Structure formats: C-alpha cells, structure tokens
Amino acid sequence: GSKPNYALKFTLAGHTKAVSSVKFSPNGEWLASSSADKLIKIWGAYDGKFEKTISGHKLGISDVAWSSDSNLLVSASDDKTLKIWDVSSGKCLKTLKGHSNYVFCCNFNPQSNLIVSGSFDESVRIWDVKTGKCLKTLPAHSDPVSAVHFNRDGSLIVSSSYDGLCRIWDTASGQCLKTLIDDDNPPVSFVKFSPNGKYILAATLDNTLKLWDYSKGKCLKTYTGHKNEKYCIFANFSVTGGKWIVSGSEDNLVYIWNLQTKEIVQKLQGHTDVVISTACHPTENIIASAALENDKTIKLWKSDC
Numbered sequence: 376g377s378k379p380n381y382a383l384k385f386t387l388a389g390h391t392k393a394v395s396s397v398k399f400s401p402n403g404e405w406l407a408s409s410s411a412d413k414l415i416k417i418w419g420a421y422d423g424k425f426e427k428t429i430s431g432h433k434l435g436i437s438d439v440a441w442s443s444d445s446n447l448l449v450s451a452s453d454d455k456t457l458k459i460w461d462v463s464s465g466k467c468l469k470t471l472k473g474h475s476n477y478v479f480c481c482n483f484n485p486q487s488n489l490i491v492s493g494s495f496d497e498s499v500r501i502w503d504v505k506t507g508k509c510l511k512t513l514p515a516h517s518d519p520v521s522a523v524h525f526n527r528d529g530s531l532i533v534s535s536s537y538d539g540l541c542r543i544w545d546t547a548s549g550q551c552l553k554t555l556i557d558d559d560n561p562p563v564s565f566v567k568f569s570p571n572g573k574y575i576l577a578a579t580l581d582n583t584l585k586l587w588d589y590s591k592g593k594c595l596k597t598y599t600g601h602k603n604e605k606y607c608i609f610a611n612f613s614v615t616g617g618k619w620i621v622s623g624s625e626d627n628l629v630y631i632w633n634l635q636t637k638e639i640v641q642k643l644q645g646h647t648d649v650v651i652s653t654a655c656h657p658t659e660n661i662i663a664s665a666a667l668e669n670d671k672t673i674k675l676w677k678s679d680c
C-alpha cells in the first residue's frame with residue numbers, strides 16, 4: 376500500500392550495555408550488532424536467531440560494517456583500533472592501529488579492498504584490507520568525526536563532524552572535492568550517500584535530517600518531527616517497498632518519512648531508550664532498531680509495504 380505497516384516480530388536480547396549500531400549483511404542472511412559491552416553479535420535476519428558473539432576489542436565498539444561479499448566485518452572501538460573479522464570463524468584477521476583517540480565510525484568501499492574510519496582524533500583514515508596498513512590520514516575536521524561512507528563506485532568518501540562540516544573526499548588522492556555543509560553549528564551527527572550516489576542524507580543535532588544534491592550542493596528535502604540533539608543516530612534509505620527515510624530518535628521511537636512528500640508515515644513504539652541505530656533489510660521490508668543502555672535490545676520490524 377501507500378504507507379508502511381511495520382510491526383514488531385522479534386526482540387533480540389544479549390548485549391549487556393548500550394547497543395551502538397546494527398547492520399544487515401548484503402546477502403540478507405545476518406544482522407550484526409555492536410555494543411559498549413565490547414562485543415559484536417550475529418543474529419538471523421529473518422527469525423532473530425542468535426548465531427554467535429565476536430570478541431577481542433578491549434573497550435566499547437561504536438560501529439560495525441559488512442564487506443560487499445557478506446564474509447567480513449570491520450568494527451570501530453574506544454580502544455583506538457578497528458578490527459577486521461572473518462564472520463565464519465569469528466577470528467580477528469587484522470587490527471588497524473593509527474588513530475590517537477576513539478574510532479567512532481567505519482565502512483568498507485564497494486570493492487571491499489579499503490576501509491574508511493572516523494575518530495575523536497578529528498581525522499579520517501583509509502586502510503588496506505589485505506595488509507591492514509593505513510594508506511592515508513586525512514586531517515578532515517576540527518572535532519570528532521561522526522560518520523564516513525563511500526559512494527556507489529568507491530571514488531568518493533563523505534564525512535561529517537561535530538565541527539558542523541560535511542566534506543566529500545577523493546578516495547584515490549585523499550584531497551577535498553567540496554565542503555557540502557559549512558556552518559559553525561549545529562554538529563553534523565550523520566551522513567551517507569543515497570544508493571545511486573547522487574544525494575547525501577545528513578543529520579544535524581537540531582532535530583533535522585536533510586537530503587542534499589551532491590553535484591549542485593543544495594538541500595532538496597528536510598525531514599523533522601523526531602528528537603535528535605545529542606546522539607549520532609543513523610538514518611537509512613528504505614528501498615525494498617515504498618521509498619522511505621528511516622531514523623531512530625531520542626524519544627525512543629523509530630520515525631519513517633515518505634522521501635518525496637516528507638510526511639511522517641509511521642512511528643514504531645517499543646524501545647525504552649534512545650533508538651541510536653536502524654538498518655533496512657536489502658531485499659525484505661524489514662527494519663532492525665537498537666536502543667541505548669536502559670533497553671540494550673534490538674527489534675526486528677516487518678511491513679507488507
């Protein structure tokens with residue numbers, strides 16, 4: 376139908392501190408969760424079946440991301456490292472050392488030969504997956520880096536920071552192509568490219584999401600009605616059914632907007648803390664949501680539309 380009807384199917388309990396992020400494997404079979412409890416957990420995407428725990432970080436994890444082939448994870452930790460994991464064995468393949476403060480955010484490129492990382496140390500780093508070596512250090516921002524994402528062909532990196540900037544980097548050279556948002560405030564708490572790489576979805580800590588045309592460098596859409604003044608809350612493009620924007624909120628709800636109309640089409644109620652992270656299943660109308668330390672659970676929601 377014209378609107379989604381997401382309904383709770385499973386609650387996934389196990390993390391002992393705040394959940395930090397959830398991501399669906401590109402092949403659709405798994406959900407990965409990261410937590411302040413220093414653990415990665417793997418769950419069945421369709422039945423919420425707990426699969427395994429992946430251990431090794433010495434401090435809390437802020438982010439976890441999947442390789443294109445669904446075989447590897449990368450995690451970003453307060454221990455100042457990233458770890459590349461073999462999902463099948465649960466083994467740490469590489470520890471990426473270089474950041475001088477907490478690593479907050481990470482992603483593979485589509486090729487999954489590189490990792491990008493953002494840190495409290497105000498830098499973005501680009502890592503070789505095979506060797507685990509740092510290839511480039513970008514002096515990207517003047518405050519913690521909130522998010523990092525590659526575009527569809529891997530040629531660009533978008534970064535955001537508490538410095539109030541969103542910047543787009545040339546992957547090959549590490550040089551800045553443009554500063555898309557250039558305000559002193561508010562903090563830009565999240566950014567990512569649209570699936571086709573033409574747009575950037577950006578969250579600011581004034582309870583606002585915006586969709587930007589990258590090439591033109593102007594705002595096409597604004598989404599409001601949720602609460603976001605404190606946390607780096609993820610936002611998603613939902614594309615399997617109706618074309619939505621999905622975001623957690625500091626009022627403990629998941630918000631779903633019509634992308635084109637900007638109307639709120641659903642609020643998912645159930646979490647008992649801030650919903651820090653949502654993910655959209657790659658083929659099914661399924662949302663995963665995760666909450667901070669008063670809740671510590673992941674919820675799987677399913678919609679007919």
Ligand SMILES: O=C(NCCCCc1ncc(CO)[nH]1)OCc1ccccc1
Pocket residue numbers: 394395396437438479480519521522523564565566605606607608609651
């Ligand atoms: O949002 C949080 N922590 C909650 C868990 C991590 C959530 C997260 N990881 C990656 C993303 C988006 O790329 N979002 O910290 C905000 C903060 C910042 C600076 C000083 C105090 C507090």
